[model samples]
Target: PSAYGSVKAYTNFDAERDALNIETAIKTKGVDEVTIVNILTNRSNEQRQDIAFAYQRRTKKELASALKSALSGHLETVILGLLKTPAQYDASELKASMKGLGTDEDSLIEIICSRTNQELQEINRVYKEMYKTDLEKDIISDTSGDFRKLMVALAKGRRAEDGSVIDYELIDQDARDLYDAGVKRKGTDVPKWISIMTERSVPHLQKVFDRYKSYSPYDMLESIRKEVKGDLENAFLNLVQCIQNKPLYFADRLYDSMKGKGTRDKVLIRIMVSRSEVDMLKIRSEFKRKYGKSLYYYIQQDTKGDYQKALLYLCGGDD
Candidate 1:
C-alpha cells in the first residue's frame, strides 16, 4: 500500500540455514536488534549480497518477499524502506505518506528534524522526483500555525555549518547572547536563543551548552525557570534544555505539562514525537538518573490513548 514495495530489504546473507530461520522470525516480529544488526548494519555491499544469497537459499524465497509477508503497516514500510537505496527509499516513504488524504506529520517531522542538511536536500530531490510536488509545500498544506512554521524551517535543513571545528569563543558568544536575551531582557529578545539552537551546528551548539553551564551555576532550563515566565520563555527554554541536556529537559517538560492543573498536550506531543527517533535512548538513560523513574513509566502515568502508544512506539518500539 506504500511506495516501498519495490524497495529490497536485505543487503547481505550468511549461508547458515539455522540463522535464516532465526532471521525470518526476527524480521517478521519487528525485533529491534535483529533489524539493526543483521539487516541494516550489513555495511559492505559484498557482505550484504552474501547474506541475502544465504537467506534466499535457505528460506526458498526472496528475503524481501518473506519480510513483506511477515510484516505490515508503518513498521513494515520503514523496515522495507531501509532496504532501498537510502535516498530512493526515504524519498519514496516520505512521498507515499504525504501525498494522501491525511499526512503523517509525525513521520515528516521526525525525518526532517533528525537528518542533517545534506540528507534533507537529498530527500527533497528524491521526494520531488517521486511525488511531483515540493515536500515543504506539501507539509505546509498539511499543517498550520506555529507548528507548521517550525516544521517547515526544520525541513529546509538550513543549518549554518556541519563538522567544522568548534570554537569556544563563538559558543560563549551564542550562549551569552541567549542568556542576555532570555534572562536579562526578561523574554523580550528570546529569539536569540532560537537562532543559536536552530541555526548553528550541533557540535558547536554542544560547546556553547558546556560554556553556558560553566558560566552560570545553573543550567539553561533552571536559569529560565528562575528568571523568565510565560509560554515564549517556556518554549525557548524547552528547546535549549532538550539540546543541551535532553533527559533532564524532557523530564521537566513532562513534569511541567502535567504537574498540577492540566496537561499541555501540544508541548507533550511535540517533544515526545520529535525526540523519540533520534535521542529517546539518551532521554531514557537521563530519566533514570534525574527522576529515578523510567521514561516509560512517566509516559504511562501522564498520557493515555493513541498518544501514549505513539510515544512508546518511538522509544524503539517498546524495547
Candidate 2:
C-alpha cells in the first residue's frame, strides 16, 4: 500500500446498511447526490465492492447501474470508478483508450508506465478477460515506430521487481551508455534508452539517474528534452518523472488538466478516481506546495454542482 493514501478499508462496515442507504439515495425524488457521495467516497474500494454485492442481493439490480441511471456528469464517473477494483478500472481505461480509430496515447503511456510488474500483469489479465483480445496485440496495432516497441516491451511485465541490490559499477555503465546514446551521438539511439529504462529495477534506476548528473552538464530531464521530441519524448519524460516522484508527477498532471481555456475532464476524472485511495493526500500536498493553490480550490474553480462536490470529497480535504 502507498504510504500516503488517504482512504482505508472501512472497519466495522455494515454492507447491508450501505446498500439500503444507496438504494434510498438512488430512489429519492431528485436523487440524493450528497448521500451517495458520502457513502461511496468514504469507503475503500473493497468495502464498496462488498456494498455492491449486498445491494445486488437486496435490490436485484447492480449498484453501479442504479447509480448510473440516477447520476450524471463527473459525479457518476467518480462513483462508477469506486465500484471497480483497481485492476478492473485500469483494464476499462485501457480498453477505452483503444476504442476509437485514433488512440489516446497519453492515457496508454501513463497507465502502462506508472504501474509495477505485478500490477501490469493483473491489468493485462483483466484486459484479456474483459475485452477478449490481447493487450499487446492491440498496442502493436495502435502504435508505431520505436514508441510502439517500447510500449510492447513494457506490456510484457518484465521490469526487475526485487529492488534490494545496488550495483554502482552497473549504474556508471548505464549512465555512460545513456549519455552516449543521446548526447554524444549524431541522432538519438531510441533502442538504447528503451532497453535500459525498461529493464532496470527502480532502485537501480534511481541510482543511475543520480550518477547521470555527473556525466552531463544538464540534468537527465533536460538532456531528454534536448535529445528527443514528440510522443517518444513524452513517454520517456513520464517514465523518468514517475520514477523521480510519482506523487509530484501526478500533482503536475492534475495542474495541467485544469489549466488553460477548458478542463480536460477525462484526465481530471481518471487521476482523481485512480489515486483517491492511493497517495491522493500526498498528491494533494504536492499540488499545494508546487502550485501555491489547493487541488480542492482548482476543482471548485473549474467544475460545478455534484461533480465538484464529489471531487472535493475524494480529494479528502482542502490544503
Candidate 3:
C-alpha cells in the first residue's frame, strides 16, 4: 500500500514534492476548500509520520508544526497527536476523548476492530510502557457495559492470523455444546462458548462460526447477544462481526451510530486516527451502502465544533 519505505523515504525528491503540494493546499485552501487536503491532513499518525518526516528533512522543519500553523479546530488534535509516539499518543488521545463522556462507540469500534493481533499486542505493550498501565485497564476505567467489554476484548490481543486451519470435528462438537446448553438446558454458558471460539486459530474459528449459522437459525453474535451478559457478549460480537464480514460490519456500525441521532464522535475520530492509510476509503464506500446516505451528510447533521471539520476532511469530502 505505502511506498515511502520507513519514515525517511518520504523526504526524497518525488515524495518531497508531493508533500509540499499537500502542505501548500492546506495553507491556500484551508481544509474546507479542498476536502482531500483535510482527509490527508487528518489521516493516521503513521502516514503523517512519513509525510512530515519527509517534508522536514527536505525543508528543515516539522510537518506537524506546519499543519498547526495552517489548520484549525479538531484538525489540531489529529495532527498534533500524529507528532507524538503512535502507541502512547493513541492511548492518551482515546483517554482524553472518553474520560468523562459517554462511550465513543464509533472510536472503540474502529480502533479495536481494525487492528491485527500483533498490532494490538504492540499497542498493549507500548501503552503500558509509556503510561505505566495497561490499555485494557485504561479502557475499563473509561467505559462500561457491552461497549467496555468490546474494547477490553480488542485490547487483549486475540486476533487469528493467516496459515491457520479448521477443525470440523471441533466445530461440530462446539455447535453441539452450544445447542445443548441453550435448547436442552434452557440456558447457555456464555464463557464456555467464547473460550471455544477465541482460543481457536482463524481457520478453526471460521469453521466454528460457519457451523454455528448452519446448526442454528440465528447467527453466533445474535445468539450471544441474547444469551450472554455484559462484556463477554461484547467480546463474542466483536469476533463474529470481524469474521463474518469485517469491513461491511464496521461500515454498518459507523453509519448506524452516526445517523438518526447525534454525531458518533468516537467513531469519526477513531477511524480518522487509525485507518486513513490502511483501508478507510473502502470503509467509506461500505458506509454509504449501509446508510443509503452520504457520510458527509450524516456528519454534517450530527457533528459541530472542530470535530466536524476534521472528520469531513478525513472522509475525503472535498476530493
Candidate 4:
C-alpha cells in the first residue's frame, strides 16, 4: 500500500541540508523554483514535514508563511499545500470551501464523501485547532436541508469501520432498507439513505450497493440521481463512486479538473497534493484508462511552468 504512493521517503536523506537548500532558494531574487520544486516534490509529505520543521529552525519563519511571501499563484498553491499534514490540508480545504460568498459544494462533496472515518476524525481535530471552531458548525451554516444533515452526520466521524466479522444478512437488510427508502417507495427517504450511506463501512456499503441491483431496476448511483438532486445527488454519487473504485472516482475528478478552457487548479492542486502519497499511481492508470491519455499528459497540456513541474513530480510516473 505504501508503495502505491507516488512520493516515498527519500533514500538520500538530510533534513537540515534540505531545509537550507529551500532557505537559499526562497531568499534568492527571482526565487529558485528549480531547486524548490525538485526538493519539495521528491520527498514524501512525512519527509516534507520534517523538512518544514528544519526549515523553520533555520529561518525562524513558518514554512507556509515564508513560501506564501516568496511565491505567487498556482506554484504558491502547490508548494504551500505540500507543507501541510494531510489532516491539516483537508481541514484547511474544508474551511476554504465554506469561506466567503458561495460554498464550494464540489469540494465539500468530494472531501466529505470521499474521506474515511479515521481521516475525518483527524480532520475534525485539526479543524478545531486551526479554525478555533467546530468543523460541523461551519458545514451546518454553509449548507442546509438534507445535504446539510448528511454533511453534519458525516462530520461527526462516527461511521462504522469494517470489522473482521461482516454480516451478509445485515448487508442484505441494509440493501432492503435502501430500496424501500428510495427505489421501492413513492418519494425518496432522505434520512434512511443518509443513515446507511454515512454510518456503514465502505466495504459493507459496496456489498449493499451491489446487492441493491437485485432488488430494483436502478442501481445505487442511478437511484440517487433519480431520487435526489443538486448537492445531495452529487454527494451520494460521490460516496457510491468512491466506495466502488476510489482511485477511478478520483481519476474522473482529475479529468474534469484539466479538460477545459481554464483549469480547475484548486482541484488539481488538492488531488495532486493529497493523493500523492495515497493513490496517485492507481489514479494515473485510471486516468489513462478512462481518458486514453496520461494524467501527466493533461497536466502538461493544461498547466504550465513551475506549477506544472510540481504536479508532474507529484504525478510520479506515466501509466
Candidate 5:
C-alpha cells in the first residue's frame, strides 16, 4: 500500500503526562501554543488519541474542543486532524469535500487516487460510520465523467494485495493498451485507464509505467495532460504521480497549496497532518530538493500565529 518508511507510532510514550501538559497548555493565560505544539507534534497519532482520552477524563473537555477554543486557522485544523485516527481524518476530509453545493473535486481526486487499498477501505468504513452515508455513493453523486468512475473503483479498495510473479510480457502489453486507449486513439478510453490504474498491483503498475514510457513519445503523465481535460486530467495525473513517487507527489501538492496568493489551508493542513506521522521526513527532504526551500520556510512565510507554529512543529523542523 502506501509507504510507511518514516513516520510510525511514537516510542517513548507518556499518555498521562501528555494529557496533563495539553491541559496546562490550553488553560494557561495566553494559551501556550508552544507547549501545545511540543506535546502534540511529538506524539504519534495513537499516543495523541490516548492523550485526548486522558485529557477528557481529567478536564471533562475534548482535547479537540480545547484546541479549537485555544487556536484558530490552519493550526487548529492541523491539530484537530492529528486527534483523529488516519482513517477518521480521511473520512472527515472526504465528507468535507462533498458537503454543501459545490464539491472540492481536486481534494476528492487527490485523496481517492493517492491512497492505498487498505487506506481506502478504512476511509470507506469510517466514512459510512461517521457520516451515515456511503463513500462510493457520495463520490458518484458528487462527481461525473470518467473521474467519477475512477474514484468509485478506487474507493472499492480492490487493488491486488500480494505479489505472484512479475509478468514482463503482460506489463508490456498493458503499456501498449494504455497508449492505444489514450494517445493513439481519438477521445481517449477512460475505462481502460481506470481499470489498469486502479486494479493492478503497485509493483505491476510500476513495471507497466516503465514499459509505458518506452512505448509513448511523451511520458504517461504528459500524455494524460495532453489527452484528458479538467478533473479527469487531475485524477489521472495524481494517480500517475502517486505511482511514480508518492513523496514527490506530496511535495508537489504542498508547493501547489502554498505557492499562490491565498493558501489552500485545507490542502496544506491535510498534507501536513496526514503525512506528519507517515513519511513527513521524506516529504520534507523531497520538498527541499524539489522546491529549493524547506517545508518549514514555506509554512513560516505562508502562514502566521499559532497556525504557523503548529505546522513548523509537525514539519519536524527545517530540512
Candidate 6:
C-alpha cells in the first residue's frame, strides 16, 4: 500500500461499534449516509471487512446485502464497492465484464492491463472463490484470437520481475523482433509480440520501446495501431502507456470514463476503488497536469450526492 493513499486504516478502530452504527443507520428509513461515508471512507478494506463480519454476526446478514436495501443508485454502488477487498472487487469487476449479453471490454482492458502479476494472481484466486469458475476460462469464453491469448497469458501471472537484469544487446533484438513481427511482416506475429511485451522487465521494456523508436520503423504505439485493432489495440496501447507512465495512463483513462455521454460509473468506481490504496494520489496529480483540471473536479462535475462524497474521499484530495 502507498503512504500517499487517500484512505488508510483508522488509528482508533472499533469494528463492532462501527457495525452497530452502520446497522443502526441501515435499519432506519433515514439512513445516516454521513456516518456510513465517514466510517467506510476512513477505514481500510481490512478494517471494513472486520466491520462487515461484525455486522454479519450482529444482524445475521451481510453488510453489503443489507446495504442494498438501504442505499440505491450510485451511492449504493460506491458503498458496496467499498465493502469488498481489492482482490474481491477486481474479481467481481472481471465477472461483471464477462457477464450478461455483451462484454465490457474497457473494464477488461483496465483491470487486466493495469494489475501487477501478484495482483492478478490474487484476483484469479478470488475470482474462482467468488464465481466458482476460472478467470482464464471466462476470458476464453468471452474473447477470441490473439487478445484472448494475451488475456490468458497475463492471467497466468508470470511477468518478468521489475528488478530483473537488462541485456543491452537483447533489448535491441527484442525491438528488432517486434519490428519484424509487426511493420516488416506480411502479417503481424501476435504471439511474438505478446511474448516480448508480457515477459520483459519494466526497465528492459522501457529501453526496448525507446530503442524501438530509433531502431524501428517508428513509434511502438504507431506500430501497435498499424498492427492490431479493437480490444487488442486498446490492450497494447494501455500496456505501453501503463509501462511508461501508469499514473498518466490511468489519468487519461479516468478522463475517458467521465468524458462524453453519461458518466461511466462502473469505470469510475473501479478505478477509484482499486487505485485509492495503490496510487490515487499520483492519479490525481496526473489528472490535474494532463487535463488541467483536478480529478476531484471531474467527479464533482460529473457525479452528485453521496456517491460523489464518498468518491472524493477515495480520490484523496483535489489538486
TM-score of each: 0.51, 0.96, 0.70, 0.97, 0.94, 0.96
The C-alpha lDDT values of all candidates are: 0.58, 0.88, 0.61, 0.90, 0.85, 0.87
Candidate 5, pairs of clashing residues = none
Regions of model 5 farther than 4 Å from truth: 1-11, 162-164
Instruction: Identify the runs in model 4 with alpha carbons over 4 angstroms from their true place.
Output: none
lDDT of 2 at 134: 89
- Weakest 10 consecutive residues of candidate 6 by summed lDDT: 157-166
Clashing pairs in 4: none
Tell me how many residue pairs clash in candidate 4: 0
- By summed lDDT, the worst window of 10 consecutive residues in model 3 runs over 3-12
Best by lDDT: 4
- Compared to the true structure, candidate 5 yields what TM-score? 0.94
Instruction: Tell me the tens digit of each residue's lDDT in model 3 across 175-279.
Output: 777766553356776546655655556666667777777777677777776777564555567667776666666676666667566655545555554555455
Q: Model 2 over residues 1-319: C-alpha lDDT tens digits?
A: 6656777777679999999999998889999998998888888888898999999999999998999999887777878887999999999998888888988989988898888899899999999998899899999999999889888988888998755667889999999999889887789988999999999988888888889988988778888899998878888899999888889999999999998878998889889988987889889999999999999899989998878877887788873
Instruction: Report the C-alpha displacement of residue 187, candidate 6, in angstroms.
Output: 2.9
Model 2 TM-score (2 dp): 0.96
lDDT of 6 by residue, 1-319 (tens): 5776778889988999999999887766788887888789989989999999999999899898888888888888888998899999999989989998778888888888889988999999999998899999999999988889988887787898866466989989998998999888777989999999899877889899999987666699888898889889989998889888898898998999998878988888888888888888888888898888899988888888888889888887773
Clashes of 5: 0
Per candidate, the number of residue pairs that clash is 8, 0, 6, 0, 0, 0
**Candidate 1 C-alpha lDDT tens digits along 137-210:** 98788766545666677678797886656576787888777667655554445445556667987778877877
Better of 1 and 6 by TM-score: 6
